[PDB]
Amino acid sequence: GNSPQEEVELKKLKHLEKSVEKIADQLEELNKELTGIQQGFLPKDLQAEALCKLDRRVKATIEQFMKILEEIDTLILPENFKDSRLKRKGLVKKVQAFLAECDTVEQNICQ
Template structure:
């Protein structure tokens, strides 16, 4: 008990003004999270989801025998203070049961296939030409072919972005929304890289024209 209290005091010194730790009990697991008195129950439940992986829409939170249901209420008004222990009830998110999440995951696999074309096909060959490993008389034709391949890569990325944009999710499908956001960001980064490779090809074309 002394060590636990000491840990709380140590952690509180690292937190911002007004912040304090509370303990989440979910099954056999216990998690310490940092909250503030002005945090609403809704925001707290979203935070709980990030730790326990129980969707905030299906959580049941018990505190001192009470079921907390007013999502607009602040933790202060609910008397959830420093060191409070809250029991979290609910099933963890299972991606296999979410068709929306699976649709995004399938598109993500397609992104990996296109990325392989870029990283194992186009980029190494461009680097070989830039390094002088290819006969100069063949470089012009090779660069033209690589430019077409890169155009195909970008077109596939664009189609995948359109597919992601066309997916419709319920408000409760937070994980699917987050997964889509991460895949969109991944595609955007790959397209930026593709643009850089395209610029490199253009520079090499001037050299071998």
């Protein structure tokens, strides 16, 4: 039953999908630097500092992911907008798997 109006919603969802990709890239960059940092030529106080810099950066990643979530949470999708509904659902769950990732890094660095 593909309508003009669902197209608006699908385009919103795709711009949100790309935002997500930017943040996920930020998370990938975080993880890569982290693995590098636990390569201790640095003194332990300093490695610690650097790990807290990383922790503040995961916090911002969590935060940006949460702001996306709040935005998607503004959508009202009719039952028959099956296509957007499905894209909205996959995007929410993708973010939450990314959030779980950030919790893993964050729970584990700068306690």
